[PDB]
């Protein structure tokens, strides 16, 4: 049957950047003309594929790997670049072939005096591969003497709350991205249009 | 008391180049966020360039190209190449190592960029 | 590109007194801006961080308040050593960010 795009667009809650939460769409119709003809969605870069054309091809998985992160942190989803957030979060290959959607949640991912439930990694001893995941919430030793699993001097916790509130810029306000990777394996293809 | 002690500061001719060196004591530079700031003799404070832990370095727009930092990895130095110098590159440059509830400035290395 | 202003240019203060320091971003830059103190000859001094936490090691009487395009910096009693130039970073792209341009605390 159709594909649950709309089940992954508009789920109530979405997963912190640095455990950005990954569903598998196989054996399907997708239908992506609902997702390119919404109005919120501010972003939707595609690499390597038409969002026009995309109804006319079909690929044996799709991946749709969701995430809160900041508005002004939306630049970095895409491929070759590098920041906060490509570097310990969410890295997209270089090759990478499929579509990156955003919109601003400010509405209802805002909480008056901060809503601390979403976090990153800020800090990471190297970066990570395309598409890696590392949820380890392990102390950051960023000093010499070892400080035994205890945050401290020269020690810190990798994670850091975003913080949203109602108010602050554009740039400041949280955004929903959900970002889809098309696969093909040799195996037979599952995901079609029509 | 964190120390960055900076190196590698002094007079250079217009159009020169100079590769000043930090390094720090307790702490290992290659996984901090490690900046550069500069201060032009009676300014103020400007930030010029930083490192990430994992490797990305980012630079004002006014000083990409000409300003290259890099580190190494083995002698536990942070390094700022600078390129095409000009007499306005005049500044106390200070290297700053970053984190979320800390700032350790080095005590800055003087840069005079003169004839 | 985000300007801070900071005024007064200069504060002159009596010794025990309260001093109040402004910084006014020409974008709303949130909670994320920084105070730095620099003696003369000395690097700057982290104070606040969000523009409200109190640094490790810094004094009770320094305490920052305000958000998004007004921010300040109140010093309860300035003491003997409280007197020195204090500077506002915006920090919306940590750890990048543009100073403003101090704000120095002198009387005579």
């Known amino acids: 049957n159709l594909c649950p795009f709309h089940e992954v667009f508009n789920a109530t809650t979405f997963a912190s950047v640095y455990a950005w939460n990954r569903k598998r769409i196989s054996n399907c119709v997708a239908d992506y003309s609902v997702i390119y003809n919404f109005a919120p969605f501010f972003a939707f870069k595609c690499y390597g594929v038409s969002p026009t054309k995309l109804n006319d091809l079909c690929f044996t998985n799709v991946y749709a790997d969701s995430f809160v992160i900041r508005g002004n942190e939306v630049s970095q989803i895409a491929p070759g670049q590098t920041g906060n957030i490509a570097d310990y979060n969410y890295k997209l290959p270089d090759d990478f072939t499929g579509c990156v959607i955003a919109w601003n949640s400010n509405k209802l991912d805002s909480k008056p005096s901060g809503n601390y439930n979403y976090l990153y990694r800020f800090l990471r001893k190297s970066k990570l591969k395309p598409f890696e995941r590392d949820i380890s919430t392990e102390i950051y030793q960023a000093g010499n003497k070892p400080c035994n699993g205890v945050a401290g001097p020269n020690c810190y916790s990798p994670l850091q709350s975003y913080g949203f509130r109602p108010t602050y810029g554009v740039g400041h306000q949280p955004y929903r991205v959900v970002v889809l990777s098309f696969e093909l394996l040799h195996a037979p293809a599952t995901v079609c249009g029509p | 008391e964190v120390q960055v002690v900076e190196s590698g500061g002094g007079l250079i001719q217009p159009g020169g180049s100079l590769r000043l060196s930090c390094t720090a004591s307790?702490?290992?530079?290659?996984?901090?966020?490690m900046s550069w700031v500069r201060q032009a003799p009676g300014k103020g404070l400007e930030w010029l360039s930083v490192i990430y832990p994992g490797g990305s370095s980012f630079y004002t727009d006014s000083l990409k190209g000409r300003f290259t930092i890099s580190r190494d990895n083995s002698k536990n130095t942070l390094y700022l190449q600078m390129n095409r110098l000009g007499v306005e590159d005049t500044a106390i440059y200070y290297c700053?190592?970053?984190?979320?509830?800390?700032?350790?400035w080095g005590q800055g290395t003087l840069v005079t960029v003169s004839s | 590109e985000i300007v801070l202003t900071q005024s007064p240019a200069t504060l002159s203060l009596f010794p025990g007194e309260r001093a109040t320091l402004s910084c006014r971003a020409s974008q709303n830059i949130g909670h994320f801006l920084t105070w730095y103190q620099q003696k003369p000859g000395q690097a700057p001094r982290l104070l606040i961080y969000d523009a409200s936490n109190r640094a490790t090691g810094v004094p009770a009487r320094f305490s920052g308040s305000g958000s998004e395009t007004e921010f300040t910096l109140t010093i309860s009693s300035l003491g003997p050593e409280d007197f020195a130039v204090y500077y506002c970073?915006?920090?919306?792209?940590?750890?990048?960010?543009?100073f403003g341009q101090g704000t120095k605390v002198e009387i005579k």
């Open positions: 970073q915006e920090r919306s792209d940590w750890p990048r960010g543009t």
């Open positions: 700053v190592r970053d984190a979320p509830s800390e700032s350790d």
């Open positions: 307790e702490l290992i530079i290659s996984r901090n966020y």
